[PDB]
Amino acid sequence: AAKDVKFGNDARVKMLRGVNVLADAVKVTLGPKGRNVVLDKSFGAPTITKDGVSVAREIELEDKFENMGAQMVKEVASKANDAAGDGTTTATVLAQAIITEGLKAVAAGMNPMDLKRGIDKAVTAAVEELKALSVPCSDSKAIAQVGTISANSDETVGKLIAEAMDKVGKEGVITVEDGTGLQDELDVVEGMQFDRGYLSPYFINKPETGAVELESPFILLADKKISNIREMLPVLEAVAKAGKPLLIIAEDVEGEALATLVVNTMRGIVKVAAVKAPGFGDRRKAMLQDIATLTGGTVISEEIGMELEKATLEDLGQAKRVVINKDTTTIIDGVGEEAAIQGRVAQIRQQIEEATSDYDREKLQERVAKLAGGVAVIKVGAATEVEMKEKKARVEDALHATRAAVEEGVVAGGGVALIRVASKLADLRGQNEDQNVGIKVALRAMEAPLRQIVLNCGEEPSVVANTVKGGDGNYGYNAATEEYGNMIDMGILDPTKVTRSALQYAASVAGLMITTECMVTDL
Amino acid sequence: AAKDVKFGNDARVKMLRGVNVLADAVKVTLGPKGRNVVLDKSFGAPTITKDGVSVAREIELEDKFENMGAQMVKEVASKANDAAGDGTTTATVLAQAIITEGLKAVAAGMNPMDLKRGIDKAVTAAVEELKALSVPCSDSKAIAQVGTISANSDETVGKLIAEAMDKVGKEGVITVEDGTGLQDELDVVEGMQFDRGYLSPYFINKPETGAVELESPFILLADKKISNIREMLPVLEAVAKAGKPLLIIAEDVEGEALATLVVNTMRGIVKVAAVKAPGFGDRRKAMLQDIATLTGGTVISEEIGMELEKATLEDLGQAKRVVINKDTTTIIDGVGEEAAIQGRVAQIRQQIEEATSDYDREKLQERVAKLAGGVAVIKVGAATEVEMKEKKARVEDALHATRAAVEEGVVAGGGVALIRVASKLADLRGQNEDQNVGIKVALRAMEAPLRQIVLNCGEEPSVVANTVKGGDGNYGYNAATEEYGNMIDMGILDPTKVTRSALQYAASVAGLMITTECMVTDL
Amino acid sequence: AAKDVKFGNDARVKMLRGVNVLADAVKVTLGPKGRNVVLDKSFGAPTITKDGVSVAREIELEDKFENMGAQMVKEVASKANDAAGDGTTTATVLAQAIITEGLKAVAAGMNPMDLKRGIDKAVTAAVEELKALSVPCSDSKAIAQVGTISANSDETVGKLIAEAMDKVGKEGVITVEDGTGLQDELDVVEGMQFDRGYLSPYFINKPETGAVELESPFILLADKKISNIREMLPVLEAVAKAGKPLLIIAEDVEGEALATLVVNTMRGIVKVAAVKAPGFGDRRKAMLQDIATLTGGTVISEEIGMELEKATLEDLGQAKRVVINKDTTTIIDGVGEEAAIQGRVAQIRQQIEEATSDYDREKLQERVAKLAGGVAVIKVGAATEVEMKEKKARVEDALHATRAAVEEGVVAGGGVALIRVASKLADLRGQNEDQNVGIKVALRAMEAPLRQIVLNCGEEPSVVANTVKGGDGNYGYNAATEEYGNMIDMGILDPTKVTRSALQYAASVAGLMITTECMVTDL
Ligand SMILES: Nc1ncnc2c1ncn2[C@@H]1O[C@H](COP(=O)(O)OP(=O)(O)OP(=O)(O)O)[C@@H](O)[C@H]1O
Ligand SMILES: Nc1ncnc2c1ncn2[C@@H]1O[C@H](COP(=O)(O)OP(=O)(O)OP(=O)(O)O)[C@@H](O)[C@H]1O
Ligand SMILES: Nc1ncnc2c1ncn2[C@@H]1O[C@H](COP(=O)(O)OP(=O)(O)OP(=O)(O)O)[C@@H](O)[C@H]1O
Ligand SMILES: [K+]
Ligand SMILES: [K+]
Ligand SMILES: [K+]
Ligand SMILES: [Mg+2]
Ligand SMILES: [Mg+2]
Ligand SMILES: [Mg+2]
């Protein structure tokens, strides 16, 4: 359609206004004194959330240029959520700070591409300094504290995550789901988890989580690829009067002969899903055999000759819950048979004792780790649904932060790590003066998380930023108690991955946006 | 419908206003100090782009006559992008300059057709002078510099293109695709590339690139043309539950019995495509055999008697990525078997040693060059999707510019080549005075790229244009450093094809538009 | 009333938009290639004028903040017109340039008060350098050239002013008035001129010149101050049926018993005016006696005892034209008696021969200079009234410029003097960096007159500014012939007072306006 085309300062101030609307809505949530945001839903009751990416996602502005700025910055929170599952508000605050100071530099006549290059150089150096400053999770041993900080100082949530990682291992799979009582429960049940996703984007359920849950599902397993429709239409009908939702695990799944016909079939009462299987050839066969033994099901094959038309519903596997996500699909509780599960575990232990090839040994030890660790499940306890969603979001943040902590390490929380790396980057210089100003813009913007935290405390951000900068090491500002101390000692720990990801995604988007001279949108 | 009809100066100033809106939006992006343009998308987040043709494509105006002018000039950027893949902003700047000065001449009462003839004569002479001024890429040997200049002074991108051309040859196929890390990666993998396009315009995917990508596709090969639908409906169903997207390579593909039925089948989850095969008869058979051996597939034939109904999914070829474009379709990574690939390479080397016919020898050496060079793939590394699109556009510009440089040569960058050829054309005369004024309009307009570059530097375009004109040879103005020097020495190189194409397409459209006395549009 | 209150950038861009509207309307008139502006009048036919202050005065904008900016800049042209009578367009161009560059510096975050201080320091230094660069009019001897340049290269006007100054002296009084023929006539007639103004602001005639003209007036002279109304009401009635307009010359004139009653008397057919007399005591008596002898009138006094009630209309003085202005009031042609005038001249020559006191000698020699020089009158010849107003404005500009040239000297025209003094001020520094930037803003803005002249020539301002800067001395750019040369040799001379006044008034207003953070206006 016809386009509104804005240039220079007018376009930049409109885009910055959109950035500011999104970032203010997100930044009210930052820190232990951060507040909640109510997002209206046409689907049902409004959602009360502290999660920054949720607020960012809901933001859309009437002014098209302001909306453009808001959408580009919303990408920061989305990328931070996708990569680390936490720090989306920190990422938004950093992005807004970089954009604000970089646009001020642009208004000062400095070359915006050189400002972006300086920002990028400063952020690369700051990521290196964050890696250097990071303390490995083995050394720190504060999973409870990391989860507590990520759960908005909910010590119960952090303790639950710590117990789950003590039971299923620091690499074991933990899944958050809605409970029934008022208290958060933890249960380690036998389940499975593989790094695959759904093959159809229309499988999304009513909740907007992007991960689809099925209660008491039926499991179908196949390694050979079926061709004709009429040889599993009876099997499809059998599962279509079994009563339990169908989850198929295969090598790969198409949509033009399976997904389209079935979506033309139902209207959305009960869901049927199909996903890939990890590995290929013998590894995929072993994976499907393990899943079938876990769920009590069977795997069809060409060599066996066991056809689908002879399969019954008792032959197929049965589970209690499955959560399918693009990144990773988990089967929460497959009943099967406990004796059969133990026998398979013993058989694969004999496989440990027999195998000698390095790749075979490592994949088989991955199999035994997945079997022995099991699946930890956290039942979120809340009196109401709005409290359920808020608490589940906080527990999911805690899980993501603890995973990031065991993956990449921890740094001082409360924006202190960014302050320290900014102080360590004070001598960083670019190729010209505009690159130096971009570096300074990035360094000042890495003070923004701490300053926003202090603002959310009702305190003076410049005084606290000055006091933290004047300190050294993990000295920082407890925002829960409004006093200074060693951030590690008071347990205010951030995952290094979370801080680094927030900085990187904020920098990429914000450095791109400060380089914009014209914006084109609809009238 | 009813038509608004405008004449003479009113029509011309409206059309020029539309030209100016489009050209200003595009020209803010010109040069190393050029800035980015944010294009709003209804599909998702706005795209930040320096690419001039992207900005030009997004431009559409409310005023119908201004929109008419904008659309005709948008044709300049589109043609420059189609022909050279670079210089679209230079082409737009040249077109706007020719239009502005030619409309000034028209207002001076000079015959617009004679002005157009003078512009055309000057541009033909300037293309000849650009060919004379061009330095062959073998002599210059600055592929890294050409790619760096085209990538907006991104030395990493230019070095990556230079390494890719050092690995797969200056004629080898290089494909840009989205990476996963933050860094640009280069990998030379075994693949295929042929000069064919899709037979259906509705195969366009969600991205507006015009080239469609498929991840881990299945490969179907056929030289004989099948007739009845029921003899590959089972095979179609097999691929429709194989899980991988289908890509058919045949002699030629229709749409009234294949495309319409399948588009009535799916709603757009997984795509199935079919394309032509290069050559005919024995050459097409050799091409399909080579592709099948690369992907591990098989080729059906009448002499063999191997029917499609007996084909299995293991018999069909499997790849990792394919990119289908109207100009050229590439298979990025076909796994097949490495030993089989090497054996086929040895067999075709024996074919080199055996064949003696000149056409057969040259086509067989083309086959061995395509097999030995392989496919270079550049993984664009970016933290975010908007940065991914911007960086991928810059790398695609660099690839197009390096291809144009090895095809047609290089000239001094920064608009210097056009300045030099304009100086060499100072004595060019037409058949009358209006043709001479058209020649002068073209010659002055070829200063416009340098002048716009200087304007984007915040500097004085007339002073720098005067200084560059007063110099000789590759003397010009480094806009990155705002100082004069030998453009070849500082590595500011433009592909001669890019400069020539920009000038020619700008001239054709602009010379046509300055001849317009009436415009007819909707009310 | 309720106030719209704007802050920061919004207020500044609105004010700059108003500045730009006024300055563009004025600047189209600058230089020999400058064009005319038509100002609509509700009174009658529109006025075509090249005069910059006329255009500036007519400018008023709908947007209140833009109007505010326009009004403050209009003060520049008004002050330049009041002080020098020329250079109002140069003053406006300088003011717009200072405002534009200073607002750019303000947007760059620099302290606007320090920018204003730097501008003021640069302008003080530039005024000193203009005084140093100035060539006295005695040395240059180019009154014809100064008048020609001020009359928009009208050599006839400059020659007329040169002849008038050759006849009545370089200090003699010259008055421009409408002629009757098509040619500009010059006549030196016996008249008087004193530095006084009207005592009532409601005496303004229908033309908006601010100086009121009376044709064939009657002259009344008085040194003693009358008290009762009834003792000159008969005399007032006598002049009220004499037929000629009344002009009273007294010590001082009130309004509450003279002006209010008479303005309640007439409706505006024939005007009666009263003005002060120069000097005091004996000097005022000598002045009134000289004026009475020039006009054939008589002066009342207490010592003489000659009362007003006995005065007749033949006793009162009679003239042909008088022009009354606040700065200076002139009697153009008082008939009186030529023999009486010569006898009075001889008597005052005897007074020269008799007087010895220095103050008495100098005032008496001022008297004899005023009597001997007489009054030069330039009859503007034009076919039409619009041409009459345009030509009269140009001749008035020429008169003001020649007066300024004989007062303060001449410098190279065409903005060259400002370029030279800016070059001589390249090492000027302030107390801080913002003051240095203000100095640079002023120095760059003194290039603006030449650059605007070049723009009005259709040429490239940066190239010509560079060429003029690269020269030295009076080297500059003839804009009439579009070529370089010695500005003094080609007769392009500006009065030093005009250039200095333009710079000073532009600097004062513009430096004040760049310091503005908030604007308050009506809604
Ligand atoms: N008691 C505390 N004192 C100081 N800083 C704290 C404290 N508790 C948390 N923080 C800091 O608050 C930040 C995390 O805040 P929050 O979890 O509200 O937002 P986020 O992680 O940026 O984003 P989101 O959770 O929405 O993805 C971290 O920098 C953390 O160190
Ligand atoms: N450092 C530099 N100094 C001078 N000129 C430069 C420099 N870097 C690039 N240029 C010039 O800028 C022009 C290319 O600019 P840019 O890539 O932004 O636009 P384009 O090639 O016209 O169009 P597009 O890339 O949008 O298709 C060329 O003329 C090139 O020589
Ligand atoms: N032939 C010429 N070549 C170069 N400069 C010239 C020439 N004639 C006049 N100028 C310059 O033009 C300027 C005067 O222009 P103009 O009289 O139109 O405007 P102004 O004096 O600024 O204002 P205004 O007359 O409206 O009060 C001076 O700087 C003068 O030197
Ligand atoms: K939060
Ligand atoms: K560009
Ligand atoms: K003027
Ligand atoms: Mg958090
Ligand atoms: Mg380019
Ligand atoms: Mg003048």
Swiss-Prot record, chains A, B, C:
Gene of this entry? groEL
Top enzyme class? isomerase
- The residues the record assigns to binding ATP are 29-32, 50, 86-90, 414, 478-480, 494
Q: Which GO terms describe its cellular component?
A: cytosol; GroEL-GroES complex; membrane
| N6-succinyllysine carried by residues | 33, 50, 116, 276, 320, 389
Q: Which HAMAP family match?
A: CH60
Gene Ontology MF annotations = ATP binding; ATP hydrolysis activity; ATP-dependent protein folding chaperone; identical protein binding; isomerase activity; magnesium ion binding; unfolded protein binding
Q: What keywords tag this UniProt record?
A: Acetylation, ATP-binding, Chaperone, Cytoplasm, Isomerase, Nucleotide-binding
**Modified-residue entries (N6-acetyllysine), positions:** 116
Note the Pfam families from the entry: Cpn60_TCP1 (PF00118)
Iron-sulfur listed as a keyword: no
Q: Reproduce the UniProt comment on modification after translation.
A: Phosphorylated reversibly during heat shock. Can be UMPylated on a tyrosine residue by SelO/YdiU, probably under stress conditions.
Family of this protein: Belongs to the chaperonin (HSP60) family.
Q: What's this protein's name?
A: Chaperonin GroEL
| Effect listed in the UniProt record for changing residue 1 to S | Complex stability is significantly decreased.tuberculosis
* Subunit and partners: Forms a cylinder of 14 subunits composed of two heptameric rings stacked back-to-back. Interacts with the co-chaperonin GroES. Can form asymmetrical complexes, composed of one GroEL and one GroES, and symmetrical complexes, formed between one GroEL and two GroES oligomers. The asymmetrical complex is the functional unit. It was suggested that the symmetric heterooligomer may represent a transient intermediate in the chaperonin protein folding cycle.
InterPro entries in alphabetical order: Chaperonin_Cpn60_CS (IPR018370), Cpn60/GroEL (IPR001844), Cpn60/GroEL/TCP-1 (IPR002423), GroEL-like_apical_dom_sf (IPR027409), GROEL-like_equatorial_sf (IPR027413), TCP-1-like_intermed_sf (IPR027410)
Q: What does this protein do?
A: Together with its co-chaperonin GroES, plays an essential role in assisting protein folding. The GroEL-GroES system forms a nano-cage that allows encapsulation of the non-native substrate proteins and provides a physical environment optimized to promote and accelerate protein folding, probably by preventing aggregation and by entropically destabilizing folding intermediates.
Catalytic activity, EC? 5.6.1.7
| Annotated localization | Cytoplasm
| One biological process term in Gene Ontology | response to heat
Domain text: Each subunit is composed of an apical domain that binds non-folded proteins and GroES, an intermediate domain and an equatorial domain that binds ATP and is involved in inter-ring interactions. Forms a large central channel that appears to traverse the entire length of the cylinder with no obstruction. The central channel of GroEL functions as two cavities, one in each ring, that are separated from each other by the crystallographically disordered 23-amino-acid C-terminal segments of the seven subunits. The entry and exit of polypeptide seem to be restricted to the apical end of each ring. Modulating the volume of the GroEL central cavity affects folding speed in accordance with confinement theory. Small proteins fold more rapidly as the size of the cage is gradually reduced to a point where restriction in space slows folding dramatically. For larger proteins, either expanding or reducing cage volume decelerate folding. A stepwise reduction in cage size results in a gradual loss of cell viability.
Name the major location: cytoplasm
Q: Give the record's free-text account of how this protein's activity is regulated.
A: During the substrate-folding cycle, the two GroEL rings separate for effective substrate binding and chaperonin activity. Ring separation is triggered by ATP binding to the trans ring of the asymmetric GroEL:GroES complex and avoids formation of functionally impaired symmetric GroEL:GroES2 complexes. Activity of the GroEL-GroES chaperonin complex requires Mg-ATP. UMPylation of the chaperone by SelO/YdiU negatively regulates its activity, and may facilitate survival under stress conditions.
Catalyzed reactions per annotation: ATP + H2O + a folded polypeptide = ADP + phosphate + an unfolded polypeptide
